[PDB]
Design a protein around this nucleic acid. Structure first.
Ligand SMILES: [Mg+2]
Ligand SMILES: [Mg+2]
Ligand SMILES: [Mg+2]
Ligand SMILES: [Mg+2]
Ligand SMILES: [Mg+2]
Ligand SMILES: [Mg+2]
Ligand SMILES: [Mg+2]
Ligand SMILES: [Mg+2]
Ligand SMILES: [Mg+2]
Lengths: 88, 218, 129
RNA sequence: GUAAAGCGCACGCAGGCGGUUUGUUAAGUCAGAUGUGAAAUCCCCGGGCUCAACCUGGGAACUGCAUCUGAUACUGGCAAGCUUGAGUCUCGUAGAGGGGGGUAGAAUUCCAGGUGUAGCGGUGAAAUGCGUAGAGAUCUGGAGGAAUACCGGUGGCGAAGGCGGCCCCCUGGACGAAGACUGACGCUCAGGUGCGAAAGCGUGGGGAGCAAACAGGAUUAGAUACCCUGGUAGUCCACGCCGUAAACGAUGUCGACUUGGAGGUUGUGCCCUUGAGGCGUGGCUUCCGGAGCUAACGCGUUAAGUCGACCGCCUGGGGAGUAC
């Protein structure tokens, strides 16, 4: 999946504080990680469809996370996108 | 409850979710009947039993099984009670009209041996027809005298006697039987959650009901 | 997923009844209580309790008359994705009267009879007969 | 499920549905009232032509729309939460899950040489065929492609198709455990997007074995077959296309309930485990079977039982999944 190091690292850079892995923001971040890192792996092989399934899931899951955030706090949503350069 | 402490549970681990409300535990990989509520059962049974048993209550003790067999006879034969311990004929209760016909044949067959009405035909025939009485006195013997369905019946185990019971409740005849784990209570209307075997266990309640029944005759 | 908690409660009872189960349990909620109450006031269930503090439970005891169960039939009516509202002069008559129809009125969750008399209509919930 | 009928399978926008608590609102909803809903029909009661048909007085009804005044249980909106739904983190567990690259051994075939000599191969027999130009058998050396005995299973993993030697790298999912965190972020999904056995198609490779086509031999009345001797496509590879199958459990997905028995597989708490073991407790999975369901066969806690949310589909046979 993801490296424990980078995992914990990104946990604070967005976590509401410390060791609070679960925040709508935290998740999105942890998601975009593998989401972007996988592309590098997918750029190659390409025919690894079965692994794509996972990639796509996290992709859609992320959208469902952001969509929610924006609904529960337009603030964090607009700010979160920036630190990740998401939303086009 | 006294002598009741001589049978406890029975059957390894096959039971039946229907006997649950009567099971105590299962020490040593074996279900143990809840005798703590078994004796109380005896009341409703032994009560209603002697009740109708008063007016020459036609009681039918059933115990086709081996163990109880040799015993079941004495019990019912200790008063105006009848018994059946040899392969319950198919319909000897419901199809009585037809079954009784065999009884009559048996009756007259006895008279044959009774007086000089036996010494007839070649030894072959005599020896031939004699065999007939043998089995007949087994499958219909302990019931030869009972013109008409019994007022009730007390079957040993509700399992091995599935056929017998099936007819009883069909003729609207109250059923009294000892059920346990593997047994199916949905049949008998008077649940007697107790060991379905154990030479001692069977004789224990066998005569027990016999007495109350014979005693109920004033 | 639980898109209809009311249905669960109802089904829980009928399923239990036929199962001879002594009593039934489930997560309580304002509405569930009101229904369970009417079910008791009408003589369909022995009683009912609500255990738990932070997590509400609902000790609903079933009732069995003779060698049979009291609730011979209980089905949901005004279910989700298809609501049902009637008028004072519309309330259905369960089992020609021998039955009851729990209807939520602006005055509370009462039985069809009561509602019809109070002159107010509401939302049906089930037809316990 | 087998009668017509579950998209081959997933992700998911619109749409439909939405755990739990308090407050608030009052839109749906309920109540009251006010407009209006033409008269005639219809309906009830009552009249008038001798009766009836017919005519007529009154009421009812017009199941509807709008306004106003309330009621607030439920649904909807809003506010603040909550944690059991869903998800996140930590640590493990098993796995023929997927993509890429290596590599080993058994065998077949082919090439070369040795030994050796009249058969071999095949069938029901045969025959075609291969053999004295020396086969077959036997041994040595080499080339090459494809597939991985045993383990292996009532087995495992995957959404489905499907995935078996061993090794490395990249990668997806599932499960348990203690717990820690977010706080309804959920379920379903027309259209859409993507995945899709085999056969087939395009380009360029590869080609041992097997084999549509094709050619012989045999069989038969015939034999455009089955059988035998050969053998091209293809089967293999890379990339692209084709989207079908009895794509089947002929059974859509998610969730909650409802007696049992025996077994497989994988995780885990606890107990002199002295030894395996015993008390359990999650995930996945076989077989039998109760209630109930079923036209029956049968299904049966992995339901085809009892219920809820959403979806797809059926409406007599042939013509025809055909024509346009
Ligand atoms: Mg067919
Ligand atoms: Mg069909
Ligand atoms: Mg399918
Ligand atoms: Mg009018
Ligand atoms: Mg509300
Ligand atoms: Mg192919
Ligand atoms: Mg090709
Ligand atoms: Mg599986
Ligand atoms: Mg079965």
């Amino acid at each position: 999946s993801l490296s424990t190091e980078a995992t914990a690292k990104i946990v604070s850079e967005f976590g509401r504080d410390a060791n609070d892995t679960g925040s709508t923001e935290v998740q999105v971040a942890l998601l975009t990680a593998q989401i972007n890192h996988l592309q590098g792996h997918f750029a190659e092989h390409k025919k690894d469809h079965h692994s794509r399934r996972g990639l796509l899931r996290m992709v859609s899951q992320r959208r469902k996370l952001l969509d929610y955030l924006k609904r529960k706090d337009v603030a964090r949503y607009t700010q979160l996108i920036e630190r990740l350069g998401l939303r086009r | 409850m006294l002598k009741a402490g001589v049978h406890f549970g029975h059957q390894t681990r096959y039971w039946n979710p229907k006997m649950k409300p009567f099971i105590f535990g299962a020490r040593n990989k074996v279900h143990i009947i809840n005798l703590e509520k078994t004796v109380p059962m005896f009341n409703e049974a032994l009560a209603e039993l002697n009740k109708i048993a008063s007016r020459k209550g036609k009681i039918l003790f059933v115990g086709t099984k081996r163990a109880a067999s040799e015993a079941v006879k004495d019990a019912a034969l200790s008063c105006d009670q009848f018994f059946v311990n040899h392969r319950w004929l198919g319909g000897m209760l419901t199809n009585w009209k037809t079954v009784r016909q065999s009884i009559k044949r048996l009756k007259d067959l006895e008279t044959q041996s009774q007086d000089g009405t036996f010494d007839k035909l070649t030894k072959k025939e005599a020896l031939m027809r004699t065999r007939e009485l043998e089995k007949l006195e087994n499958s219909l013997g302990g019931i030869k005298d009972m013109g008409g369905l019994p007022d009730a019946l007390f079957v040993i185990d509700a399992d091995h006697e599935h056929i017998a019971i099936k007819e009883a409740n069909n003729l609207g005849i109250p059923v009294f039987a000892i059920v346990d784990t593997n047994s199916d209570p949905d049949g008998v209307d008077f649940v007697i959650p107790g060991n379905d075997d154990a030479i001692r266990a069977v004789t224990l309640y066998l005569g027990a009901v016999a007495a109350t029944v014979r005693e109920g005759r004033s | 997923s639980m898109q209809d908690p009311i249905a669960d409660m109802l089904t829980r009872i009928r399923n239990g009844q036929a199962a001879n189960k002594a009593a039934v349990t489930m997560p309580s909620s304002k509405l569930k209580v009101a229904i369970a109450n009417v079910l008791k006031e009408e003589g369909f269930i022995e009683d009912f309790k609500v255990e738990g503090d932070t997590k509400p439970e609902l000790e609903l005891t079933l009732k069995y008359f003779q060698g049979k169960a009291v609730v011979e039939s209980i089905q949901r009516v005004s279910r989700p994705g298809l609501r049902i509202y009637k008028r004072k002069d519309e309330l259905p008559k369960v089992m020609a009267g021998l039955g009851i129809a729990v209807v939520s009125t602006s005055k509370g969750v009462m039985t069809d009879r009561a509602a019809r008399q109070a002159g107010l209509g509401g939302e049906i919930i089930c037809y316990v007969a």
